[PDB]
Structure 1
Amino acid sequence: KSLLSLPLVGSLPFLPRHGHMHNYFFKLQKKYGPIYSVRMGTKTTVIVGHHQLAKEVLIKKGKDFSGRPQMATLDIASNNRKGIAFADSGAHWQLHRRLAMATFALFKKLEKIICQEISTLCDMLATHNGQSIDISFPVFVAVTNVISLICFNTSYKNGDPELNVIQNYNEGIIDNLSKDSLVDLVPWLKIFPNKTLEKLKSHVKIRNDLLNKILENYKEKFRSDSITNMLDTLMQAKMNSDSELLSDNHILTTIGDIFGAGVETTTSVVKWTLAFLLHNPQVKKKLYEEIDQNVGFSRTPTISDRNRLLLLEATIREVLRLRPVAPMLIPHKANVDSSIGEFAVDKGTEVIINLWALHHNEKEWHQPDQFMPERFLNPAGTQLISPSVSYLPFGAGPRSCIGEILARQELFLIMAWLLQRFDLEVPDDGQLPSLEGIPKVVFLIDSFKVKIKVRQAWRE
């Protein structure tokens, strides 16, 4: 079993119509195969674009590849590799990941917290009846409150200016955080603001100052006899020790990861989903029929309705396939000498899963470039199915998403409540939203407007 050297690609030329980096590397697989590497100075990066090899990296050898590479921008955002998402493997990451996951067991109620913020969201949108608006902000408020309650048992009231403070440093960090090491090899894709690094520090300081103020004030509120939220879980763990792993700054960075991920991922997917529905009125009408028939207008949707709003479930699965939140996940790193397929991978090598490539494998999916929720239903439309093994929207293995349950609950309920109450149409001017996307740390959609109107079937 002597392993082979990885294919090494010496240069990455400009190629027309290749779009974003994840599609560019995907298309290069036709010439170099499903796994190949590039070198920058002393650092080697391997890109993996087939599900079998990806599952080896993520699952079968998940521990070998559970590291995270060091990057200047990621260092800034994670306060030098604290927190969860950008923390290297080891004792700090394992502890804070375990505690974050333990916190979600205290909400088994999650549906109730979410529905309360969605009702406020719908009330706010109904006030704009007849207008064409960007719904980013209202949705941002609802999911921000959900995660604030999970983290602190606090919620913001409509109009609180802190919501705008958070939205603006969120946008500022995301716009200046580059997680793609290879960008310098494909300079025509390196798109960042003028003074990127200082602007990133500027916005991160704002975030760190606000969270530290919350955490410091929370020391006065914490009691060991009531552990109901994430900061409680972290503070109790410090007391009950490990104690060096739970520094104030470690706790602050972990809270920051959850606070940011809990808002920017789900808000993005909601916007993507609505955009796809504006481009596919046929699907939208079938979603209205499904909800009117299985829920009606007597009551509001609940999580139990996931068993009967099957096309809605399929639509979300299809958005997560076609515009993945993380089309190249978060970069991995080999913690030890290891292997992928028949190839040797040295300790320290950066390993990137091209999830875009998995989600557009023409041999594992039928017409992968088009929005077809029905691929996740049987022919009758009566049961959800998994048509492909090349589908990993939340990752897998040791570094898999820890917010999946929350995300799926938020996405289902938000969409269901919105479809029950509102007609969602293209604006008066013809403008449809661009589906091209903006490949930042989250795969964002260009801002767009939607004509929203209370459905008159919802008259009473």
Structure 2
Amino acid sequence: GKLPPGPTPFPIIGNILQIDAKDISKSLTKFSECYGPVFTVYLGMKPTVVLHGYEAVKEALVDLGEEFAGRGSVPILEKVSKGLGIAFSNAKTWKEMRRFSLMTLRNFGMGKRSIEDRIQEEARCLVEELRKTNASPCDPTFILGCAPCNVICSVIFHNRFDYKDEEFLKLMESLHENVELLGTPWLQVYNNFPALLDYFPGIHKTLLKNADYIKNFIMEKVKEHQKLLDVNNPRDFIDCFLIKMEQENNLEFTLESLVIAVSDLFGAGTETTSTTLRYSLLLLLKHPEVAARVQEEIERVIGRHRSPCMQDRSRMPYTDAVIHEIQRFIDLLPTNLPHAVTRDVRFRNYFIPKGTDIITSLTSVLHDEKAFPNPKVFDPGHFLDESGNFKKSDYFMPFSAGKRMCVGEGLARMELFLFLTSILQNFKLQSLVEPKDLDITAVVNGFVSVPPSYQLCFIPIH
């Protein structure tokens, strides 16, 4: 019996007034200092168990993986998914979509053209459009959003779009707008106070219009794929899904579920990778010696006359340590994505009833002071041994862990490695201000820690 301890909840509104509206993780870490690694908080009337620290997070997500494999409250967004898709689905529907997606999203899961090849083509397109900035000051937000989005287009539709393509920009504008409107760390909130929906219908209204533009953009391509389907040679996510439908026995596979599953991948993989890439460049501007050392490794291992490839990563410990350090340092999703227990569970000396929402503090793992000495300081050394070789850490958990762990983790890491090295191989980064005046403090917008706005010049290396 009994839920974990926690701050005394004021009637109806819960612990809201005790949580920093700008930085919930910071609040969760303060609560943990006086309630321990496992505590409860109220985002309204319903209790939410918070897991803080590597041991608690790992014990639940990994050791008790099935119990914590549920997708917690994610209002509106969960509703547009209609219990289908991957991110907000649960039980059998989730299991089948996730299994299908993992098998399909392998490097060579969709024919002879690997996911790596697709990312390499995009890395070249990214370098080309950066050349078009002609070494003038520019905000990289747009182009850095296009590349990741195009990578997903390539793996889903087997097609990429020009960075000036109307529908594509629209897709990104529809994706962006939708994630912005439906942005908040709590998330559990829209499943609580209905009066707020009417006070601020703006956030909830355009979603049907744009999330439908997304669903419509996708459905349109699906129809095109059905006419060109080759059962012996599927070349993208859609074909593989269409084949799974043709033969089948699976009622979980419909054109409706395909559209939603594709919406999820786009939603989960576009903004995260884009933000990480944008934050990467900022950190390189902030610590130019890091950028210089990565370039030294690029020249020595890859050289100047060929595109970087995944095989290069194992031979580039410094660059790998830098990519790991960027993800750990930026802590993209401070509180992960909301989980929920799939059944009554006795976690340690506490009892957690089925359906209870769970929040895991990834910030507490990624910034553990013992696993990463001086955790608030950017230092690739956190992933380097005394001999300059790459050093793994069980605390490197930016993609989460367990049964719900990021489905596109492999794809994301390839994108970071190939885009960053292709960028540093072809350009020197020049900031308008000195590193000492460069703001690198993140501001959590929705679920994501985004870097402050900045501009830079991409000076071609020749």
TM-score (norm 1): 0.90
Residue equivalent to 1:9: 7
Deviations 1:36-62 (A, max 9, x none): 102355521011111111112111111
Q: Which moved more, 1:289-298 or 1:348-357?
A: 289-298
Structure 2 residue matching 1:245: 3-state secondary structure: coil
* Aligned residue type for 1:102: M
Distance 1:228 1:250, change over 3 A: same
Q: Which moved more, 1:67-76 or 1:15-24?
A: 15-24
Q: State whether structure 2 residue 171 is matched by structure 1 residue 166.
A: yes
Distance 1:40 1:290, change over 3 A: closer
Measure the CA separation in 1 of the matches of 2:332 and 2:317: 22
Match of 2:51 among 48, 52, 59: 48
Residue equivalent to 2:207: 200
Deviations 1:259-310 (A, max 9, x none): 2323222111111111111111222222222222322213232212112322
Match of 1:221 among 211, 223, 228: 228
Shift of 1:372: 0.8
Task: Map 1:46-85; keep pairs closer than 5 Å.
Answer: 46-78=49-81, 80-85=82-87
* Aligned residue type for 1:432: L
Measure the CA separation in 1 of the matches of 2:289 and 2:200: 39
Is the CA contact (8 Å cut-off) linking 2:175 and 2:267 kept in structure 1? Answer: yes
Shift of 1:340: 2.6
Shift of 1:258: 1.5
Distance 1:59 1:286, change over 3 A: same
Is the CA contact (8 Å cut-off) linking 1:427 and 1:450 kept in structure 2? Answer: yes
Measure the CA separation in 2 of the matches of 1:171 and 1:29: 33
Residue equivalent to 2:441: 435
Q: Which moved more, 1:310-319 or 1:41-50?
A: 41-50
Residue equivalent to 2:426: 421
Deviations 1:6-52 (A, max 9, x none): 11322447679995111221222111111110235552101111111
Task: Map 1:139-178; keep pairs closer than 5 Å.
Answer: 139-177=144-182, 178=184
Is the CA contact (8 Å cut-off) linking 1:23 and 1:357 kept in structure 2? Answer: no
Measure the CA separation in 2 of the matches of 1:10 and 1:311: 47
Task: Give the total of aligned pairs.
Answer: 446
Measure the CA separation in 1 of the matches of 2:73 and 2:212: 20
Is the CA contact (8 Å cut-off) linking 2:304 and 2:425 kept in structure 1? Answer: yes
Measure the CA separation in 2 of the matches of 1:365 and 1:18: 27
Task: Map 1:224-373; keep pairs closer than 5 Å.
Answer: 224-373=231-380
Identity percentage over the alignment? 26
Structure 2 residue matching 1:220: 3-state secondary structure: helix
Structure 1 residue matching 2:359: 3-state secondary structure: strand
Deviations 1:320-364 (A, max 9, x none): 111123221111111111133322111110011110111222233
Structure 1 residue matching 2:454: 3-state secondary structure: coil
Is the CA contact (8 Å cut-off) linking 2:75 and 2:188 kept in structure 1? Answer: no
Is the CA contact (8 Å cut-off) linking 1:76 and 1:201 kept in structure 2? Answer: no
* Aligned residue type for 1:318: E
Structure 2 residue matching 1:119: 3-state secondary structure: helix
Distance 1:228 1:10, change over 3 A: same
Structure 2 residue matching 1:28: 3-state secondary structure: helix
Residue equivalent to 2:118: 113
Residue equivalent to 2:35: 32
Residue equivalent to 1:384: 390
Residue equivalent to 2:12: none
Measure the CA separation in 1 of the matches of 2:22 and 2:35: 18
Shift of 1:438: 2.7
Is the CA contact (8 Å cut-off) linking 1:174 and 1:441 kept in structure 2? Answer: no
* Aligned residue type for 1:38: V
Deviations 1:98-137 (A, max 9, x none): 1111112325722221111111111111122221112222
Measure the CA separation in 2 of the matches of 1:21 and 1:265: 19
Shift of 1:401: 1.0
Measure the CA separation in 1 of the matches of 2:412 and 2:187: 28
Q: Which moved more, 1:34-43 or 1:19-28?
A: 34-43
Measure the CA separation in 1 of the matches of 2:133 and 2:43: 51
Distance 1:17 1:215, change over 3 A: closer
* Aligned residue type for 1:205: D
* Aligned residue type for 1:392: M
Is the CA contact (8 Å cut-off) linking 1:67 and 1:333 kept in structure 2? Answer: yes
Measure the CA separation in 1 of the matches of 2:120 and 2:262: 23
Shift of 1:5: 3.8
Q: Which moved more, 1:46-55 or 1:135-144?
A: 135-144
Distance 1:303 1:52, change over 3 A: same
Deviations 1:63-96 (A, max 9, x none): 1111112443223442x221101112x1111111
Measure the CA separation in 2 of the matches of 1:68 and 1:176: 21
Is the CA contact (8 Å cut-off) linking 2:365 and 2:396 kept in structure 1? Answer: yes
Deviations 1:369-391 (A, max 9, x none): 1111111001231x1112x4333
Residue equivalent to 1:103: 104
Distance 1:77 1:438, change over 3 A: farther
Deviations 1:127-171 (A, max 9, x none): 222211122222322222221121121221342211210121111
Cα RMSD of the aligned pairs, angstroms, is 2.6
Q: Which moved more, 1:138-147 or 1:333-342?
A: 138-147
* Aligned residue type for 1:199: T
Measure the CA separation in 2 of the matches of 1:129 and 1:168: 25
Residue equivalent to 1:93: 94
- Structure 1: gaps of 5 or more residues: none
Measure the CA separation in 1 of the matches of 2:451 and 2:301: 31
TM-score (norm 2): 0.89
- Structure 2: gaps of 5 or more residues: 10-14
Shift of 1:424: 0.7
* Aligned residue type for 2:395: S
Q: Which moved more, 1:214-223 or 1:249-258?
A: 214-223
Q: Which moved more, 1:207-216 or 1:5-14?
A: 5-14
Measure the CA separation in 2 of the matches of 1:193 and 1:134: 31
